[PDB]
């Protein structure tokens, strides 16, 4: 058994389905609160009514004192003889130390961290795990709030990514019968402000495996040897755990064309990119890990990151068409109080170039302009002012109709 599911999800309960000032929600959150208070009371009584204790077996303190109080951590490198291994400290100073008993001489292996004494400097224990606080921090444990209900309609893309990352888990009977390996790599590309990170959030919200999230220009350190090692440890911790998934965002900071030039720092960038490229698909194995990689311009990527076998599915997010604008407007104004006058038809049809974030900004600007004159309900002229007065930076082309 590996570290197992190691699931990452708070996700207490979302049922606020009334979504208004109804009694059902009040009674439901009452049930939630009283269960939480009940569990708290149980743990208080669990910790308060413990009467049994000796817990030293008249020798545990003996072992504790035999080993030094401020034990230090070192790196074993060889074991020439029984009871006379050879270790080293941080500064690279080796020492022909001894090995004492009360240390299971089974799990020690060259390259493993061990616990050492001060005054005599012998081996007295083995440190079980060593993960720096740059990889454990990357992990997520509280799921973000959104879900598929909020997406404005992307049926093709949603179905695609679901066949990629979700379906092989819940119902893995078909793929064996057909004899196929499910795809492992996905690219999300397109113009800015369209929804590339929404699918990341929505997938992370509802899943069962570990989720790891990394942003692009963070795999970089200045000591010439930390980048690739950090990448290696990242994939190691992902694979020792559950069927996790990794989300690398804003890649183009890492991978770009691998050309030859002068400066040494850029050589370091290329070295790190190339190490990741090996890690993803190199020699023997890969493991049960999926990778999602998101960017807003794709042509400037190294041809060795995009070839199939490493990234199997590519998904383009295009600008919304007139069918989708109505859905977006219906979602972002659902919890808004609103007047009988307005019709979203004019706003959606008058313009032909805008995206999801733009619609959200139009909604909030119009609502605020309605507030400006001491009202709550929103009218049509407010939406008109919101659309036209701001939310539009411009561009020019094809002058004066050369074509007719």
């Amino acid at each position: 058994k590996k570290k197992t599911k190691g699931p990452d999800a708070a996700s207490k309960l979302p049922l606020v389905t009334p979504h208004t000032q109804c009694r059902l929600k009040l009674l439901k959150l009452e049930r939630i609160k009283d269960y939480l208070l009940m569990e708290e009371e149980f743990i208080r009584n669990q910790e308060q009514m413990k009467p049994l204790e000796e817990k030293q077996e008249e020798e545990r303190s003996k072992v504790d004192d035999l080993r030094g109080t401020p034990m230090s951590v070192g790196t074993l490198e060889e074991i020439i003889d029984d009871n006379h291994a050879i270790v080293s400290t941080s500064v690279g100073s080796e020492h022909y130390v001894s090995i004492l008993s009360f240390v299971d001489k089974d799990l020690l292996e060259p390259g493993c961290s061990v616990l050492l004494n001060h005054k005599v400097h012998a081996v007295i224990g083995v440190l079980m795990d060593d993960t720096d606080p740059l990889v454990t921090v990357m992990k997520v444990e509280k799921a973000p709030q959104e879900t598929y209900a909020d997406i404005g309609g992307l049926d093709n893309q949603i179905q695609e990514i679901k066949e990629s990352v979700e379906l092989p888990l819940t119902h893995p009977e078909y793929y064996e019968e057909m004899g196929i390996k499910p795809p492992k790599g996905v690219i999300l590309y397109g113009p800015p402000g369209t929804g590339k990170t929404l699918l990341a959030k929505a997938v992370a919200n509802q899943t069962s495996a570990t989720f790891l999230r990394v942003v692009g220009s963070e795999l970089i350190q200045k000591y010439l040897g930390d980048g690739p090692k950090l990448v290696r440890e990242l994939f190691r911790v992902a694979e020792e755990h559950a069927p996790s998934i990794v989300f690398i965002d804003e890649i183009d900071a890492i991978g770009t064309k691998r050309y030859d030039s002068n400066s040494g720092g850029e050589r370091e960038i290329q070295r790190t990119m190339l190490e990741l490229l090996n890690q993803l698909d190199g020699f023997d194995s890969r493991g049960d890990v999926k990778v999602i990689m998101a960017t807003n311009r794709i042509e400037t990527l190294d041809p060795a990151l995009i070839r199939p076998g490493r990234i199997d599915r590519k998904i383009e997010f295009p600008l919304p068409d007139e069918k989708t604008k109505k859905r977006i407007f219906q979602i972002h104004t659902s919890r808004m109080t609103l007047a009988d006058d307005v019709t979203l038809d004019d706003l959606i049809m008058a313009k032909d170039d805008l995206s999801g974030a733009d619609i959200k900004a139009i909604c909030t600007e119009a609502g605020l302009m309605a507030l400006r004159e001491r009202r709550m309900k929103v009218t049509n002229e407010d939406f008109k002012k919101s659309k036209e007065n701001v939310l539009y930076k411009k561009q020019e082309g094809t002058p004066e109709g050369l074509y007719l």
Binding site: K1, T17, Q46, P51
Partner: protein, 889 residues
């Protein structure tokens, strides 16, 4: 700083109130004209709803507060016109005048006098003009007044009339979603006297409309999920007449009032049967209402429709009682043979075939118990008439090989091999019944009783089995003969069988197991009345158990039978009666909590669970109340299985950490039963939590506890790739997962996972929100509660019939008069709508569509098309008539 160029209102409407005290004084011109000129402006500005910062209230509150304070009380000459105008123009500003502490000031002005109709200028405003603060006042002040002085002044009568008029206003202002807030006041006004609210709202909706009631009905029906018990009953009974009084649909009354049979009142079920016989006049409204009355709620209703119209108007009772059961058996045979069911599969046991090369060679298993477990696998998987002719002769040779107990179990396997049979299952059993072997005869009688189990017809009530029972010459050949009878008349509370099985325990036979089985049978025969059985059982307990201090078979049959005989009642008077009846030593006090919780099958009472966890909290339990904590944890899943599904998840959160991490005996041993009882769907959360702490047996703990975790591993029906885990656990089950301690457990689990493709469902949840019966038996099966060493021997007699409340899997069927139509619908995920103004999409994923009589599946909602009008129940019943009606040219 915005003030100027318009604030003439803070000038003239400031001088007019300033001299308004002078108006109340010697100058009546201010008393009349100034009052009119203020009231007209206020009414005009609060009438329109376009500017939500009212321009008159917000320029007066500072001076208007003291003006109203010193005007009304210092007038002393309250004429009708002047005092009415003053009260009208000082009652409205209070919402802006005062802060949250206003409950004591809703009446300081309005109660002074009633000027005309307070809703006249508060008629078409939804939740703006007055109905918000009026609703708040009637919600809180009336409750405070009526807390103990219910019979009082206008605070009851005139408050009632005000509530009626305000409900009319809520309906007539906008008739919007605020109508769903009218029930709020209805439940906030006369909180205790809720009845005089609910009836009022019924009459108010009576002349409202015959179509705008469904939303109110749904809101009330889903508000009834959890509240005070008496409030629950009142709300349910007031919901009952709603589909009859205002609307005349009266078709769902027979379905939404069976839920109030056991939980509400026995006389409630009597009146439900009364209304079900008074209704059903339309022939369609009888065959459908009788479909669920037997195979979906409970039995013992084959005699209530035997009036003087027993040709076809009362011959339907015998049809839906047993003849419909035979027809359903024939259908479940024909369809299964049509779709997916070969005669003799017997492959899942042989599915462990790719392991032949793995781990060297075979020829390792020679255990005699293995043959027993193999037979049980071949029985369980071969349900739904999966008969094996001469392929069960292996069970004959094993029956002639060893394991007399295994011989009995193998003999009883034929009971569930030929299940729900009436034509020739008994005939098949009879050939081997006369075999001149005690164990063989007992197994034959158990199988015969199992074959007709659930049918409860008048075929062979006591013909064969009881003739052997009255000849209980052998110790072993006496328990099952009566025990099967308890199963055979599980749904029947006939006192004849009760007093006929009482003599089994009155015979004073030396076999204590016989007495235990008789107690179990008497518990599982009746779930309601007949306290005389309780008296006889308690007397036998006092006269027998006092002299013994043996295994919990006493606690496994006497208190379990007592709880089953009085199961499902929130009165708690029966609980107190049985509690004070059996005050005794702690080994008997183990049954106190058992009987306390058995009467709390399902409801919302955080008090109950709080004392349930406080009782066996820690206590350090130095070998003192381990059985008490065992039943506490085994039952913590109960009382919580209908919490509106919030409680299920929260409970899983509690059990996953609390008992699992910081537990010693209740945690390490009896913590998998709660998961094995919480749900039977199969989901990654529990299927992951169980193996992580279960495949690692943790031999340091009572390693046999891990074996229990194996059994609830198979708590999911509906075969799936879960096998892939346990299959692997099988190989590690060679060395680890001790063969002589867990081999039969793993094998029976793997047989239960893929047990019977049809009839897989077994979760006591017929209907979206009903669990009337079937938990009876399922409780005794899980009532092993540790002591698996005892289970090793008892189960060969028990486990064969331990769980015998199985319903068939499939729910999708045309169910025409001749079963003509095949199918035209779209199965999908569960509901995706609760309170939506826009079109209600129940089917989240309509993509899936089949056109056969095929299976339903657990998380599946079904909707139809092709204009068949499906006029039976429109949801799903497996027996809907679905007549066609398409008057749409």
């Amino acid at each position: 700083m915005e003030e100027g160029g318009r604030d003439k209102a803070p000038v003239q409407p400031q001088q007019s109130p300033a001299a308004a005290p002078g108006g109340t004084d010697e100058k009546p011109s201010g008393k009349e004209r100034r009052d009119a000129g203020d009231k007209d402006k206020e009414q005009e500005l609060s009438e329109e709803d376009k500017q939500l910062q009212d321009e008159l209230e917000m320029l007066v509150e500072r001076l208007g507060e003291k003006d109203t304070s010193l005007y009304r009380p210092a007038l002393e000459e309250l004429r009708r016109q002047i005092r009415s105008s003053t009260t009208s123009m000082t009652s409205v500003p209070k919402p802006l005048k005062f802060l949250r502490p206003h409950y004591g000031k809703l009446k300081e002005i309005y109660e002074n006098m009633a000027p005309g109709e307070n809703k006249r200028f508060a008629a078409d405003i939804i939740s703006v003009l007055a109905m918000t603060m009026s609703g708040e006042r009637e919600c809180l002040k009336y409750r405070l007044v009526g807390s103990q002085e219910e019979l009082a002044s206008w605070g009851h009568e005139y408050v009632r009339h005000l509530a009626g008029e305000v409900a009319k206003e809520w309906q007539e202002l906008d008739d919007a979603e605020k109508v769903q807030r009218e029930p709020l006041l209805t439940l906030v006004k006369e909180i205790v006297p809720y009845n005089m609210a609910h009836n009022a709202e019924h009459e108010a909706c009576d002349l409202l409309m015959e179509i705008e009631q469904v939303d109110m009905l749904e809101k009330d029906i889903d508000e009834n999920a959890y509240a005070k018990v008496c409030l629950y009953l009142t709300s349910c009974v007031n919901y009952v007449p709603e589909p009859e009084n205002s609307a005349l649909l009266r078709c769902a009354l027979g379905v939404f009032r069976k839920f109030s049979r056991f939980p509400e009142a026995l006389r409630l079920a009597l009146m439900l049967n009364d209304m079900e016989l008074v209704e059903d006049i339309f022939t369609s409204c009888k065959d459908v209402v009788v479909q669920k009355q037997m195979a979906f709620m409970l039995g013992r209703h084959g005699v209530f429709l035997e009036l003087s119209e027993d040709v076809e108007e009362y011959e339907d009772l015998t049809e839906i009682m047993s003849n419909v059961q035979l027809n359903s058996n024939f259908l479940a045979l024909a369809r299964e043979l049509d779709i997916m069911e070969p005669k003799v599969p017997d492959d899942i046991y042989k599915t462990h075939l790719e392991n032949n090369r793995f781990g060297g060679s075979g020829s390792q298993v020679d255990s005699a118990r293995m043959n027993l477990a193999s037979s049980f696998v071949n029985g369980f998987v071969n349900a739904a008439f999966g008969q094996d002719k001469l392929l069960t002769d292996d069970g004959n040779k094993w029956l002639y090989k060893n394991k007399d107990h295994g011989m009995l179990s193998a003999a009883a396997s034929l009971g569930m091999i030929l299940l729900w049979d009436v034509d020739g299952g008994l005939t098949q059993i009879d050939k081997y019944l006369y075999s001149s072997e005690d164990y063989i005869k007992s197994g034959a009688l158990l199988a015969c009783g199992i074959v007709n189990s659930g049918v409860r017809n008048e075929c062979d009530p006591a013909l064969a089995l009881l003739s052997d029972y009255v000849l209980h010459n052998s110790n072993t050949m006496r328990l099952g003969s009566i025990f099967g009878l308890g199963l055979a008349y599980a749904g029947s509370n006939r006192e004849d069988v009760l007093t006929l099985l009482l003599p089994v325990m009155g015979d004073s036979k030396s076999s204590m197991e016989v007495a235990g089985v008789t107690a179990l049978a008497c518990g599982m025969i009746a779930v309601g009345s007949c306290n005389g059985d309780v008296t006889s059982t308690i007397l036998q307990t006092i006269m027998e158990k006092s002299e013994t201090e043996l295994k919990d078979t006493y606690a496994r049959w006497l208190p379990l039978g007592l709880g089953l005989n009085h199961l499902g009642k929130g009165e708690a008077i029966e609980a107190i009666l049985a509690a004070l009846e059996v005050v005794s030593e702690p080994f008997r006090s183990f049954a106190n909590t058992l009987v306390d919780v058995c009467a709390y099958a399902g409801s919302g009472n955080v008090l109950k669970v709080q004392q349930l966890l406080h009782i066996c909290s820690e206590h350090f339990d130095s070998k003192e109340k381990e059985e008490d904590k065992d039943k506490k944890e085994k039952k913590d899943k109960d009382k919580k299985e209908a919490p509106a599904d919030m409680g299920a998840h929260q409970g899983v959160a509690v059990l996953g950490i609390a008992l699992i991490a910081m537990g010693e005996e209740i945690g390490a041993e009896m913590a998998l039963r709660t998961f094995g009882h919480l749900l039977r769907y199969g989901e990654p959360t529990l299927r992951r939590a169980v193996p992580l702490a279960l495949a690692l047996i943790s031999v340091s703990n009572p390693r046999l506890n891990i074996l229990d975790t194996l059994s609830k591993f198979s708590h999911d029906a509906d075969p799936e790739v879960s096998y892939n885990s346990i299959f692997a656990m099988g190989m590690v089950g060679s060395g680890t997962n001790n063969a002589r301690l867990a081999a039969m457990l793993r094998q029976l689990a793997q047989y239960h996972a893929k047990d019977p493709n049809n009839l897989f469902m077994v979760r006591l949840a017929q209907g979206l929100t009903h669990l009337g019966k079937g938990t009876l038996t399922l409780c005794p099966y899980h009532s092993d509660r540790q002591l698996m060493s005892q289970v090793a021997v008892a189960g060969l007699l028990t486990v064969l019939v331990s769980f015998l409340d199985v319903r068939n899997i499939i729910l999708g069927k045309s169910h025409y008069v001749l079963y003509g139509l095949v199918a035209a619908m779209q199965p999908r995920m569960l509901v995706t709508f609760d309170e939506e103004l826009r079109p209600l999409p129940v089917s989240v994923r309509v993509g899936q569509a089949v056109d056969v009589v095929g299976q339903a599946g657990k998380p599946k909602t079904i909707t139809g098309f092709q204009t068949h009008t499906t006029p039976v129940l429109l949801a799903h019943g497996e027996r809907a008539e679905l007549a066609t009606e398409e008057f749409l040219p």
